[PDB]
Symmetry: C2
Subunit: 457 residues, 2 copies
């Protein structure tokens, strides 16, 4: 028997493999801000991917850096090759993109880089996070939320709530897809118990009461659309991370017990989430908003937490022993970490959107500070024609964008834009999602990499 050469992919070969997957034409930059009813096109900004170092895994303090956002976007596209999508208007005239996404090549190229991508995306959780006795003590251990504060306190509550709702589109519109990955196969009575939870989310198979269909009504009632992924460029790093974590747990069955932990915790908190979400949306929108998606779990026992602990966790540790409980605990603790990152990232993004007029004015003192040599900042000189749309991304330090001539639409969130004319500009805050489009025949501008804009004031 020939020796087994262990799987290995790193360095430049990994970079080339990531670029190879992502240069499929369906992943190239969009010429618009939105995907118009095409579930096969996802913007991965492949032109940047040759220049990222996938081998040095980031810690938590840098997981909102651009390389992390790029990897979350890559991973969502890789996981979703396993999901069935058709356009709302039907497949007609989109068959070419359909076959570019569902192809042997696109699957194999994505699956080859998936281990490296998952190390980059989730490796930081190793540093961030047993008997049956203490386990049942640990689970016994388990107020305005940060999201409520961000939305209710925003200078544009409806814009902030709409930005929040679209973060959930890939999760809620494909509701229970990652959980369904754990029902394939042949194992104990726990398998039918997992299946029961999936069935509830699918509305027992009645499409009108399928939970995804209810969230369609929620989106449409506040003037948003329900086609995936219309708002791809407005998905925060942290929202993709949260969604990706459950596909990670569901696809990789050595993490099955981590998912058992996460299922208990999410079911246990589902009612409080839906009540807060129902309350918040009615506050912001009034009678207009359809919150049926959430009010289907506003009764106190309208969840699966009690059965998750009794008929999933209990039989599994008995059949497989206490060696699995540290994984059950780890799934709970990892999910809680990701939730905190989401709260931080979302609140930061809303504050960044709300501050746009002040940050346009702050361009002036920051620019003057550069003249005075307060910061020795690298400069980039760019010239771009009309319609050259920079798909949304972020930078890892603060940047100053200064318009020499022309007109730029500076995009900072859904419904959040600035028109920058000659002599104007904007302070771009580190890790904030933003993009730009050129709305004059030509635009000449500069990007100064100031690091920390406060040193220029």
């Amino acid at each position: 028997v020939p020796p087994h050469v262990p799987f290995e992919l790193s360095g430049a070969e990994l970079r080339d493999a990531i670029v190879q997957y992502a240069t499929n034409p369906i992943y190239h930059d969009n010429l618009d801000w939105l995907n118009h009813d095409n579930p096969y096109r996802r913007q991965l900004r492949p032109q940047v991917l040759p220049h990222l170092d996938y081998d040095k895994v980031p810690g938590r303090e840098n997981i909102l850096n651009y390389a992390s956002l790029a990897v979350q976007r890559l991973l969502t596209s890789v996981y979703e090759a396993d999901l069935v999508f058709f356009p709302k208007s039907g497949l007609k005239g989109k068959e070419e993109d359909f076959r570019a996404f569902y192809s042997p090549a696109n699957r194999a190229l994505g699956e080859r880089i998936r281990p490296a991508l998952e190390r980059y995306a989730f490796g930081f959780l190793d540093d961030e996070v047993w008997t049956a006795q203490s386990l049942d003590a640990y689970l016994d251990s388990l107020e305005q939320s940060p999201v409520e504060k961000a939305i209710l306190g925003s200078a544009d509550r409806e814009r902030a709530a709409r930005m929040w709702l679209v973060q959930f589109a890939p999760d809620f519109l494909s509701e229970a897809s990652p959980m369904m990955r754990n029902v394939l196969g042949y194992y104990g009575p726990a398998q039918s118990e997992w299946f029961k939870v999936v069935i509830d989310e699918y509305g027992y198979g009645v499409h009108d009461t399928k939970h995804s269909t209810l969230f369609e009504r929620t989106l449409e009632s506040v003037g948003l659309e329900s086609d995936l992924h219309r708002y791809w460029q407005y998905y925060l790093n942290s929202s993709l991370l949260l969604n990706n974590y459950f596909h990670y747990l569901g696809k990789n069955h050595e993490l099955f017990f981590r998912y058992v932990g996460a299922l208990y915790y999410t079911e246990s908190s589902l009612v409080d989430f839906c009540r807060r979400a129902d309350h918040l949306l009615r506050e912001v929108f009034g009678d207009t908003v359809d919150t049926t998606y959430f009010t289907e779990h506003i009764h106190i026992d309208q969840h699966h937490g009690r059965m998750a602990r009794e008929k999933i966790i209990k039989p599994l540790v008995e059949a497989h022993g206490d060696g699995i409980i540290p994984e059950i605990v780890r799934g709970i603790e990892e999910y809680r970490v990701l939730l905190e990152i989401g709260d931080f990232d979302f609140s930061e993004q809303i504050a960044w959107m709300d501050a746009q007029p002040e940050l346009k004015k702050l361009h002036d003192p920051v620019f003057e500070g550069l003249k005075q040599g307060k910061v020795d900042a690298p400069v980039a000189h760019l010239v771009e024609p009309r319609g050259e749309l920079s798909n949304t991304h972020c930078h890892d330090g603060d940047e100053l964008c200064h318009i020499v001539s022309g007109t730029m639409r500076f995009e900072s969130g859904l419904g959040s834009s600035l028109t920058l004319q000659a002599g104007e500009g904007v302070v771009i805050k580190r890790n904030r999602l933003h993009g730009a489009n050129i709305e004059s025949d030509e635009c000449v501008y500069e990007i100064h990499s100031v690091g920390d804009y406060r040193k220029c004031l």
Copy 2:
């Protein structure tokens, strides 16, 4: 944007990649004939994988050759990394194998070769299966005696053995019932998604485990003395059984084939009652009162299946929403599946005939062994010497072979419950494409293998 290098994997690079996947220790030869409640070990015979040509895709006349068997075994193992299994006895003591099967490496190595394995396994269908409209499709759908399995089992020299061999062929499918179909309910698509989910719920007993259909088939197996741990009977799974099961994982994993699965689902539903009626009858005739056929008698009532729904609430809205251009794919799913069924019928009939003929083929060794000694045939011969316990895991050869035992004792295994004891001077004719293996029972065995091709030419 850098230029896109199209995915490419062929020749020696592909051979090395298949070897690299398959040399994971959980895939090495078993020292016994059975896997003993360990669902992470699958025998891929990796030592022979360097010497197969994965680039030349066989046609139908050659899809029971050994390379096709080896690819079916690989593909089953690749697909099943997506399925959850735990040992019946629990995970304690099997954690290392558990993590060897569910690892980033094992998945990534298998997924890299999956395109090439699927071309090898399924490419012949392009030739076996040749614009449409909504009710030219309805005319075609409307257009769709002892069954081959009924004849194979009830015509057998050993009815019970033939039926047990048949039942174990279904273990990977029935014990993971509806797993490939579940692959189609992930995502976000129209009303068809919830109609598909209905069918999945129905084969999983609606989340009640004792009513769940895999548990019913567990009771079938145990009622005739077989076990229901996966994959206990791996070495007795025929090429065609794996091929049929893999075809649905293929359709399920690769959503460009979604409409083929829509067709296949209709055809299997509208065939299910006939199949279950015949299975229930033949098992009762073979085993009597002892056999539990509830798994089958769940579906012995005419029109109590999902076929009408699949036509009305799945096929009809998808054709309206996505256009008539998907109809050739719906038909192709039906026609490709029917080809695979024909192959299964032949392969299983051949295997049972081969098990039943073991006494005669042991005697046929004598006129064939001498026929070679008569200048008659110029057949290559390998001289093999092997120690005790050298269990050759089951495989097949592409031509007839004569096995002659110079000295020692060999257990020659031709099927579940089908064995020969071969001693000095004795031997057996090994028929092309038939599944078999051997174990050395003395502590040394000297024997010879003559590639006679067609043993007829030595008579």
